[PDB]
Design an enzyme around this catalytic site. Structure first.
Site, short mmCIF file in Angstrom:
data_model
loop_
_atom_site.label_atom_id
_atom_site.label_comp_id
_atom_site.label_asym_id
_atom_site.label_seq_id
_atom_site.Cartn_x
_atom_site.Cartn_y
_atom_site.Cartn_z
N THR A 83 22.94 9.20 104.64
CA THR A 83 21.69 9.68 105.32
C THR A 83 21.86 9.59 106.85
O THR A 83 22.66 8.80 107.35
CB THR A 83 20.48 8.81 104.88
OG1 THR A 83 20.34 8.89 103.46
CG2 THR A 83 19.19 9.29 105.54
N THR A 137 20.05 14.13 104.24
CA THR A 137 21.12 13.37 103.63
C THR A 137 21.80 14.02 102.43
O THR A 137 21.32 15.02 101.88
CB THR A 137 20.49 12.02 103.17
OG1 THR A 137 21.48 11.14 102.64
CG2 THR A 137 19.43 12.28 102.08
N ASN A 163 22.71 11.70 100.35
CA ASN A 163 22.40 10.43 99.67
C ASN A 163 23.51 9.46 100.08
O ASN A 163 23.54 9.03 101.23
CB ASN A 163 22.32 10.53 98.15
CG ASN A 163 21.87 9.22 97.53
OD1 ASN A 163 21.27 8.39 98.21
ND2 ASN A 163 22.14 9.03 96.24
N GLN A 170 21.92 13.27 95.13
CA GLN A 170 20.51 12.90 95.23
C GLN A 170 19.86 12.57 93.89
O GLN A 170 18.82 11.92 93.85
CB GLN A 170 19.71 14.02 95.90
CG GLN A 170 18.74 13.51 96.97
CD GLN A 170 19.47 12.94 98.18
OE1 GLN A 170 19.23 11.80 98.59
NE2 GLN A 170 20.37 13.74 98.77
N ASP A 214 18.39 9.21 92.96
CA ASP A 214 17.11 8.75 93.50
C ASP A 214 16.00 8.81 92.46
O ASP A 214 14.90 8.30 92.67
CB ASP A 214 16.73 9.52 94.77
CG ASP A 214 17.43 8.98 96.01
OD1 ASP A 214 18.06 7.89 95.91
OD2 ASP A 214 17.37 9.63 97.07
N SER A 255 12.95 7.76 100.24
CA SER A 255 12.40 6.72 101.11
C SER A 255 12.46 7.20 102.57
O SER A 255 11.94 6.52 103.46
CB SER A 255 13.19 5.42 100.98
OG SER A 255 13.14 4.95 99.65
N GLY A 275 19.29 4.61 105.36
CA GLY A 275 19.22 3.29 104.75
C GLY A 275 18.69 3.17 103.34
O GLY A 275 18.44 2.06 102.87
N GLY A 276 18.52 4.30 102.64
CA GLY A 276 18.00 4.24 101.29
C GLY A 276 16.70 3.46 101.25
O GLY A 276 15.80 3.69 102.05
#
Lengths: 190, 350
Positions: A1, A19, A21, A40, A43, A73, A93-94
């Site tokens: 990301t 991103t 991911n 992705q 997620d 997020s 940063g997820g």
């Protein structure tokens, strides 16, 4: 990301977080297109109660489904002060994106830090599960001791995020800051 | 007085993870483009100079605030293929297989970046797509020097996946090793893709040659993204999620992102405490925020998802009275184990 911010001469502002991911996503290029493909789908909640790569969990709401957009997020954010665009920020940063951006906002508003100060300050994070208070290097041993006495399960881990932010002064002046956690980045203007 | 100093400028400014991309954005602004024009140019540049996350094959979100205050959100998050199913990532035993959702062709969602950038550029920008894609096109065609960041990422994260695919290895690997700092990374195929997008518009990606290349990559390797998926993809402009924190208004992404809702929820909780008093790096401030965060993430696990598929109780979650009910549960001297925290009861706040 990755996240980036822009403010032009007229005061228009844009915050973008996008991103694949994970880093390089699947690492799979689409044929002769030269385009790397995202991963992705992780997620989504693959199974109720089971965590994904970021330790995030879900149920029906974020379940995989055809044509459905997996929960993210990502938090490109803009804060307004006195009716005017004041802080433009965001970060990769997820699961940690939420707390990283939250800290930029708190640092700016509650602690009155300038955009570089807020950016270089250490970060902490608690995402419920796992039950641990994740921290970066940088917090006083006296402080971590008090947190442990309060019952927090402190866990020192890898640096979190890469904020790329711009603060707009009351006179139109622009103030920007790239992240010490990311090398070869840059905030520049004219 | 300050140890850390921000960069200063009087007209325009760009902050990004990559020097080259930032300079691209600054040049666009200098040429007369607006923030959206520059933002799209930076997005295309990063797709070339920051393959780690910058992309054409992924997705994301854009928050736009006009000089007149108009604030909006652009959702260009990937859409799962039409053939995707609830249990597609489970193994024969019923347990999720992270390999399937992270390294197989089944891990990909239909890309939204190109769609999102054009939706934004066409409605809020001033420059034509070809003009904002050009910088990226040159970088892909002529190449750029690999720096520490990219060299490090290729060696660390890249080694785990890039060399496992012929087409990826042909671009990012050299002499059996990841490209090293100082090497030049030329991306001729990506340059062609960029050139075609600049000449034919976003349709090139969703219905043209690029779409065919994506569909074939999938069909040949057990993937699910089809041409129908690509043709049906669409970026969506949505109302931003926002809140008020001590008189400051905070705007962020709404579902399909959980970010806006939880940042606003946590700030609502924190507003009940004199944060300035505790100060940065104090045990009290950290304690309060860590506890507040637990409730938000517990709520995230139950109530958040694609709004076009499920009703997200965003009003209740960003309700200050609900935030107050959580704040009253926070003991500044004693942390509450996550095992004692469940998604909140929103009924009284809906």
């Amino acid at each position: 990301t990755t996240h980036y911010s822009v403010v032009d001469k007229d005061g228009n502002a844009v915050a973008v977080t996008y991103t694949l991911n994970t880093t390089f996503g699947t690492g799979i290029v689409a044929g002769e297109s030269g385009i790397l493909l995202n991963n992705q789908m992780d997620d989504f909640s693959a199974k109720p109660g089971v965590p994904n790569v970021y330790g995030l969990v879900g149920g029906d709401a974020n379940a995989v489904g055809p044509n459905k957009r997996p929960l993210s997020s990502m938090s490109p954010t803009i804060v307004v002060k006195d009716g005017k665009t004041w802080l433009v920020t965001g970060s990769p940063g997820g699961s940690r994106i939420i707390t990283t951006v939250l800290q930029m906002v708190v640092n700016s508003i509650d602690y009155g830090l300038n955009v570089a100060e807020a950016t270089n300050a250490p970060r902490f994070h608690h995402q419920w599960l796992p039950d641990e208070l994740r921290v970066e290097k940088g917090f006083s041993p006296d402080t971590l001791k008090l947190l442990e006495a309060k019952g927090q399960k402190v866990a020192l881990k890898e640096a979190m995020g890469s904020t790329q932010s711009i603060m707009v002064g009351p006179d139109g002046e622009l103030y920007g800051a790239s992240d010490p956690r990311s090398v070869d980045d840059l905030t520049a203007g004219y | 007085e300050d140890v850390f100093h921000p960069v200063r400028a009087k007209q325009g400014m760009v902050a990004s993870v990559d020097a080259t991309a930032t300079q691209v954005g600054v040049d666009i602004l200098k040429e007369g483009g607006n923030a959206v024009d520059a933002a799209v140019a930076v997005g295309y540049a990063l797709a070339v100079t920051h393959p780690q996350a910058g992309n054409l094959g992924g997705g994301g979100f854009m928050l736009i605030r006009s000089k007149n205050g108009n604030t909006t959100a652009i959702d260009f998050r990937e859409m799962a293929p039409a053939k995707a199913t609830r249990d597609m990532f489970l193994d024969d035993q019923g347990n999720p297989d992270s390999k399937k959702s992270l390294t197989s062709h089944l891990a990909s969602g239909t890309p939204g970046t190109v769609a999102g950038f054009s939706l934004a550029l066409d409605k809020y920008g001033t420059m034509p797509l070809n003009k904002v894609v050009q910088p990226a096109f040159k970088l892909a065609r002529d190449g750029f020097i690999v720096n520490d960041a990219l060299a490090d990422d290729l060696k660390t994260y890249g080694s785990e996946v890039l060399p496992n695919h012929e087409n990826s290895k042909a671009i990012f690997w050299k002499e059996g090793e990841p490209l090293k700092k100082g090497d030049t990374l030329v991306q001729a195929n990506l340059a062609k893709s960029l050139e075609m997008i600049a000449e034919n518009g976003p349709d090139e990606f969703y219905k043209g040659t690029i779409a065919e290349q994506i569909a074939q990559e999938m069909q040949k390797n057990g993937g699910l993204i089809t041409k129908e998926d690509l043709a049906a993809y669409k970026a969506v402009e949505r109302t931003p999620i926002s809140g008020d924190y001590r008189g400051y208004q905070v705007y962020s992404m709404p579902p399909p992102s959980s970010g806006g809702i939880h940042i606003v929820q946590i700030l609502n909780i924190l507003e009940n405490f004199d944060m300035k008093k505790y100060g940065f790096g104090s045990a009290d401030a950290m304690q309060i925020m860590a506890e507040a965060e637990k409730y938000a993430y517990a709520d995230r696990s139950e109530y958040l998802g694609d709004p076009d598929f499920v009703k997200v109780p965003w009003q209740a979650l960003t309700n200050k009275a609900y935030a107050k009910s959580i704040a009253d549960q926070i003991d500044i001297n004693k942390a509450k184990p996550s095992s004692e925290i469940r998604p909140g009861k929103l009924a009284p706040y809906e």
